[PDB]
């Protein structure tokens, strides 16, 4: 049934049968992932911007991002003038790819932006990646450290003066997914569902909705604040979010997971950016990123849905009653 028919003790069970994705073709296709890394790390631009690394983004036939980062960049801006020119050099390397290399799955790179699809026959799946050429601003991360704010002092630079704060969020994508892979399952299925719910909510807006990434983050927010444990109520999870939602024009929410207010560049962009008018989602991957920020009236559409959503079977027990949304602090 849809998950607008789902009530709250079905929504388990609803994130199993429709959800989950299927393991074996996940696994395929990080294998095939790994496989185009190596191949365009070693094969672009063989001939100073260079492909250091692969990997994958936000994820909805399911849709993901596929950043395809460059060094070597004078700017990040230039991600975005040469991008043309990143683009035809990377598609021509997916091709090779495509025509060298064997994968477990079907590989096609999309005809004339630019995408290739990852299907399996045997499965009934697909995943279609949209290719983001990226300046490689960490160069060498690894998780458990922050990026050295330096980095984020030359971003927050750029972004000032070109007036594109946020608009670089790309480059930190590895910061982005780590976020959101260091999670509990149950909460990693909570956020399933959740994008679910959103994109449902997509389906019927003619105008725009918060980005995905927000409510993602939102997600964490809610169980970081009203749960922080490994098992809990799936349905009671789900309708603090629809309730968090209604409150986006109180919301001031960041993290200090990869950056913090020790630099005064970063501390300043931080600052500036919580005094914007809410709802402020601070990107705990970019300093200069308000997800889903400067436009309150996209808020709007979301928290009515939110409303509808919270009169829905999704959060209610047999009797009508709400299963009730996690107490907060």
Known sequence: MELRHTPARDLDKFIEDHLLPNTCFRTQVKEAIDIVCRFLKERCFQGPVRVSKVVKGGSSRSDADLVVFLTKLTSFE???????????????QLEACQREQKFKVTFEVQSPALSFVLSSPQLQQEVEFDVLPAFDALGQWTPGYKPNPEIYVQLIKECKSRGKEGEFSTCFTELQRDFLRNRPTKLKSLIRLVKHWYQ?????????????????????????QGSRKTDFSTAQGFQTVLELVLKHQKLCIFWEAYYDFTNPVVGRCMLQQLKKPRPV????????????????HSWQRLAQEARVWLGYPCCKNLDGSLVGAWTML
């Open 78 to 92: 230039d991600q975005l003038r040469r991008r043309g020119e990143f683009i035809q050099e990377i598609r021509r």
């Open 200 to 224: 449902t909510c997509k389906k019927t807006h003619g105008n725009k909705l918060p980005p995905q990434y927000a409510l993602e983050l939102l997600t964490v927010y809610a169980w970081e």
């Open 281 to 296: 989602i601070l990107d705990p991957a970019d300093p200069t990123g308000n997800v889903g920020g400067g436009d309150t």
